[PDB]
Amino acid sequence: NAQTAFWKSLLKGPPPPPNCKGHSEPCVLRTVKKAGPNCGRQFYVCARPEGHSSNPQARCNFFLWLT
Numbered sequence: 144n145a146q147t148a149f150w151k152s153l154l155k156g157p158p159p160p161p162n163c164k165g166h167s168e169p170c171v172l173r174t175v176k177k178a179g180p181n182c183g184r185q186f187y188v189c190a191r192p193e194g195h196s197s198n199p200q201a202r203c204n205f206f207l208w209l210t
């Protein structure tokens with residue numbers, strides 16, 4: 144069943160975003176716009192809105208450079 148198999152592979156998109164530890168939910172991909180050595184680099188961070196340090200629903204501290 145090789146042939147049908149071969150094209151199934153090509154339909155497989157990039158792996159999902161990592162999940163944050165605070166909520167176990169897909170992070171979101173932001174792009175650095177600060178011109179400099181990092182300009183254009185991308186990273187993942189928690190997707191929750193910002194909020195009070197006492198708020199479990201607020202954004203958590205996940206950070207991961209996209210390689």
Ligand SMILES: [Zn+2]
Binds near residue numbers: 164166167189202
């Ligand atoms: Zn989070």
